[PDB]
Amino acid sequence: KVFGRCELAAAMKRHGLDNYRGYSLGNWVCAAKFESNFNTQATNRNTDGSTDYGILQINSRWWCNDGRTPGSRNLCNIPCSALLSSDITASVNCAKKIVSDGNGMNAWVAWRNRCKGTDVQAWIRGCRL
Ligand SMILES: [Cl-]
Ligand code: NA
Ligand code: NA
């Protein structure tokens, strides 16, 4: 599924990401745009041989099982393929564990490099939330 900006903002708000661990909704929407282009089916190989899955590009090195990432964990106890569904529940549940783990949203490279230290509220302008 390819979400619209305001359509995904609404989905994320309904799943409890607005202000989760202090990260306003725009942070999550900005992260999702640059991670997945709002595409639930996005997959991208990392240099380390891990892959990032879905709307929030959750990494197989630590969070999900894709059966081809040596020495990896599955801390969200989910197959990585379950993070590609049109329903964002599983990705949000996993993202809440990631962002709770001490480093906050710095876990997301695109958030650190493209959203952090920017006006992220722009990402939810015009949206019915
Ligand atoms: Cl934080
Ligand atoms: Na893994
Ligand atoms: Na613009």
Distance from C-alpha of 72 to C-alpha of 30, rounded to nearest angstrom: 27
Catalytically active residues, by annotation: 35, 52
Strands 43-45 and 58-59: unpaired
> How much distance in Å is there from the Cα of 69 to the middle of ligand 2?
6
Residue 49 CA to ligand 3 center (angstroms) comes to 34
Residue 65 has phi, psi (to 5 degrees) of: -100, 120
State the total domains in the chain: 1
Tell me which residue range forms the domain holding 4: 1-129
CA dihedral in degrees (114, 119, 124, 129; nearest 10)? 120
Q: How far is CA 103 from CA 31, 45, 49, 72, 110, in A?
A: 15, 22, 22, 19, 14
Q: How many angstroms is it from 68 CA to the middle of ligand 1?
A: 31
Q: Angle at the Cα of 77 (from 113 to 13), degrees rounded to 5?
A: 55
**Experimental technique of record:** X-ray
Phi, psi dihedral angles at 16 (to 5 degrees): 90, 25
Residues, the chain: 129
Residue 101, marked binder? yes
Amino acid in position 54 = G
What's the CATH code of the domain at 41?
Answer: 1.10.530.10
Q: Which ligand is nearest to the CA of 126?
A: 3
| DSSP codes of every residue in the chain | -B--HHHHHHHHHHTT-TTBTTB-HHHHHHHHHHHHTTBTT-EEE-TTS-EEETTTTEETTTT-B-S-STT---TT-SBGGGGGSSS-HHHHHHHHHHHTSSSGGGGSHHIIIIITTS-GGGGGTT---
Q: Which ligand is nearest to the CA of 33?
A: 3
PDB resolution in Å: 1.2
